Amino acid sequence: GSSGSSGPKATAQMEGRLQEFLTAYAPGARLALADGVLGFIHHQIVELARDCLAKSGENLVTSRYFLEMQEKLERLLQDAHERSDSEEVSFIVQLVRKLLIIISRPARSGPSSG
């Protein structure tokens, strides 16, 4: 829910992605996992993503931002690999990982992905 901007300029292509990430993975708004801890990740990450969007939109995201954002979300993964089983974790994993695939500076499409 931006504050009425004039569309994304820099790192826009990437932004669009983060948008679909949440639209597909939303706590309560769509699905939910009785698992308390394990869930603590879905709620956390999902929230962390939003920040990225607002950042990229104004070019606030930087090398460090991500580097740290990766360890901040990655670690959480434990909550899943801790209690929940690969089955329940599988869902989260996709997020924790995907998020890193979006924020990742190098994100584009066309000729090839590398």
Curated annotation (Swiss-Prot):
Signal peptide: none annotated. Interacts with PTEN. Coiled coil: none annotated. This is Microtubule-associated serine/threonine-protein kinase 3. The lineage of its organism: Eukaryota, Metazoa, Chordata, Craniata, Vertebrata. It is linked to Developmental and epileptic encephalopathy 108: A form of epileptic encephalopathy, a heterogeneous group of early-onset epilepsies characterized by refractory seizures, neurodevelopmental impairment, and poor prognosis. Development is normal prior to seizure onset, after which cognitive and motor delays become apparent. DEE108 is an autosomal dominant form characterized by the onset of multiple types of seizures in the first 2 years of life. The gene is MAST3. It is found in: Cytoplasm. Belongs to the protein kinase superfamily. AGC Ser/Thr protein kinase family. It comes from the Eukaryota.
